[PDB]
């Protein structure tokens, strides 16, 4: 895609615990790798991967749901 791919702008600064948990900053913006359930999602930002709460990010684009 690289045109309308998924991405959410970090509204605040998050800091996961382990690798499984992602840690971004206010204004990091992730590409979103996938969804966990509804309140938690996955994405890679700042060379870091893991999961993060959707309540701490502004979904600027949803995943490619055909």
Name some characteristics of this structure.
monomer, 66 residues, mainly beta, SH3 type barrels, 3-stranded antiparallel beta sheet, two-stranded antiparallel ribbon, 5 strands, 30% strand, globular, Neutrophil cytosol factor 4
Would you write up a description of this structure?
By secondary structure, the protein is mainly beta. It has a single domain (1-66), classed as SH3 type barrels, CATH 2.30.30.40. Helices cover 0% and strands 30% of the residues. The protein contains no helices and 5 strands. The protein is globular. It is found in: Cytoplasm, Cytosol; Endosome membrane; Membrane. Residues 3-62 form the SH3 domain.
Strand content: 25-35%
Query: Order of helices and strands, N to C?
Result: EEEEE
Query: Mind telling me the CATH superfamily name?
Result: SH3 Domains
Which overall shape is indicated by the principal axes computed on the Cα atoms? globular
**Order of strands across the biggest sheet?**
2-3-4
Multimer state: monomer
Number of helices: 0
Helix content: under 10%
CATH topology: SH3 type barrels
Distance between the termini: 13 Å
CATH class identity: Mainly Beta
The CATH architecture: Roll
Number of domains: 1
Main beta-sheet strand count, sense and barrel state? 3 strands, antiparallel
Give the C-alpha Rg: 11 Å
Number of distinct beta strands: 5
Task: Specify the structural class.
Answer: mainly beta
Subcellular location: Cytoplasm, Cytosol; Endosome membrane; Membrane
Domain SH3: 3-62
Protein name: Neutrophil cytosol factor 4
PDB class: oxidoreductase activator
């Amino acid at each position: 895609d690289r045109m309308a791919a998924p991405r959410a702008e970090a509204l605040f600064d998050f800091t996961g615990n382990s690798k499984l948990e992602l840690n971004f900053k206010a204004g990091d913006v992730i590409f979103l790798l996938s969804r966990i359930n509804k309140d938690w999602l996955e994405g890679t930002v700042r060379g870091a991967t893991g999961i993060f709460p959707l309540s701490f990010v502004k979904i600027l684009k949803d995943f490619p749901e055909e």
